[PDB]
Write an enzyme that holds these catalytic residues in place. Structure first.
Site, PDB file in Angstrom:
ATOM      1  CB  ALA A  78      38.129  38.596  36.573  1.00  0.00           C
ATOM      2  CB  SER A  81      33.653  35.159  37.205  1.00  0.00           C
ATOM      3  OG  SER A  81      32.601  36.012  36.791  1.00  0.00           O
ATOM      4  CB  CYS A  82      38.017  33.481  39.981  1.00  0.00           C
ATOM      5  SG  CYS A  82      38.963  33.582  38.443  1.00  0.00           S
ATOM      6  CD  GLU A  83      35.873  35.027  46.057  1.00  0.00           C
ATOM      7  OE1 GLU A  83      35.838  36.263  45.876  1.00  0.00           O
ATOM      8  OE2 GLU A  83      35.682  34.497  47.174  1.00  0.00           O
ATOM      9  CB  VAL A  86      36.613  28.580  43.823  1.00  0.00           C
ATOM     10  CG1 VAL A  86      36.700  28.128  45.282  1.00  0.00           C
ATOM     11  CG2 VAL A  86      38.002  28.901  43.274  1.00  0.00           C
TER      12      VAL A  86
END
Lengths: 263, 263
Positions: A78, A81-83, A86
């Site tokens: 997660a 995937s978040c980075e 971003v």
């Protein structure tokens, strides 16, 4: 660190000794990222009893080295995937900047720079299409990184080394085929046109008025007559919006071709 | 806060006065979330000169209240989407927990609880399908929140109040139609079966051995003969995998039906 992100879920009494336990995992794989997840999970108070549910769950990761192995990696997925999101948002922020800078008048008589920056934005859009089919969009992030020098982008792991050879060759190809047409419909480019060629901007906007009242209602009707779908707006609107897109694509392409000769 | 997340991008000399400026925006809309983005952008050092590029960009948001209005909202959209992924990852972590708890033997002779927890996981999966078509998956997050009491889930804004009436009625319907079949293929349920009915587990696994050598190669061939595609594995594998899925769906459905009567 991790020892502090876990401990913030417990009451004062258990705070100290729980903190003591979790310092043995500090340098496990994904321990860096799992600690970020707990902090980003801590924000969603929009509650009473839930922190007690998480703490009870966190206690179980202390027991099993295997359960914690998994849970660290799932939370790492997660975060990874978040980075990526971003890294994409930064492209959208720069897309915002250009719109503003152009309307500010930074490019007013610097068309060379906007045209060059437009090419950069176009190549990124074409890299998005190169990912949307491979079927996880971190692959787009992978393409952008490697082709940054080769395609001139200001923003092995993923796929094959020879996969870069295809995409690039397809970027060079689609740039030739569209770009000029796409640039004509570009926001920042419209921003310079209302500032610089305000007189010529009144030319193109009146042609839309002319085309929407005169040609539009007829040219939709006879397209709908030819297809045999005179009824239900699912046929009417779907075709009508295309006529608008094509009248726009035409008019704006002409205009851009006019003012780029003047340079 | 925001005053500190922005200032961390500048050298020592400019650090103090840049911090002084940005304290006038502290309570703007999205100011809460934009400050989180800068910190999550700060992690990607995997660099020299980039922090200088961001600082130069941050200086421009100080000037324009409109550019900053946009950039705050675009970064807020990413953060709002990130908190949604975070809310989903918690469901995947609980999916991990159950697999482990079952293999630990928590459910060994507590089939009522696992069966009940399986229903909860199934309803969430069916809520995912209710979102994957509406065409932004924060709508799934919206459905889950509202139907938490109505469908018994342990994890207006979005859509219409009457849209909840459809989804729920379709959950109750699909639960009746699949569940029992889906539960038969469930990981945590397989974990209890290897522990409890180890003798009967050897029954089902030998039937796969029997079906893969005997019936499989024939029943793929005659399916491929009937369709007229004897050649290229795009026809062979695609059909073969379905036979495996259906032999599995059969065998495991039988087994589950056997051991639930024994309770």
């Amino acid at each position: 660190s991790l020892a502090d992100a876990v401990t913030a879920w417990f009451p004062e009494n258990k705070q100290s000794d729980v903190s003591q336990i979790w310092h043995a995992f500090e340098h496990e794989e994904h321990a860096n990222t799992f600690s970020a997840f707990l902090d980003r999970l801590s924000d969603t108070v929009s509650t009473s009893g839930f922190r007690e549910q998480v703490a009870a769950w966190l206690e179980k990761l202390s027991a099993s080295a295997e359960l914690r192995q998994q849970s660290f990696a799932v939370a790492a997925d997660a975060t990874e995937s978040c980075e990526d999101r971003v890294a994409l948002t930064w492209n959208n922020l720069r897309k915002t900047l250009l719109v503003h800078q152009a309307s500010e008048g930074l490019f007013d008589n610097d068309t060379g720079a906007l045209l060059s920056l437009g090419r950069e934005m176009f190549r990124l859009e074409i890299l998005e299409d190169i990912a949307r089919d491979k079927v996880e969009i971190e692959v787009y992030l992978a393409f952008q990184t490697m082709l940054a020098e080769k395609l001139q982008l200001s923003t092995v792991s993923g796929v094959t080394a020879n996969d870069l050879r295809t995409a690039e060759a397809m970027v060079r190809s689609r740039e030739e085929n569209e770009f000029t047409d796409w640039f004509s419909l570009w926001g920042p480019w419209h921003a310079v046109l209302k500032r610089t060629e305000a007189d010529r901007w009144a030319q193109a906007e009146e042609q839309k008025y002319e085309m929407l009242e005169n040609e539009y209602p007829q040219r939709v009707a006879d397209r709908l007559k030819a297809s045999g779908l005179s009824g239900d707006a699912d046929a009417e609107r779907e075709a009508g919006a295309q006529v608008m897109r094509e009248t726009e694509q035409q008019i704006y392409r002409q205009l851009t071709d006019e003012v780029l000769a003047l340079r």
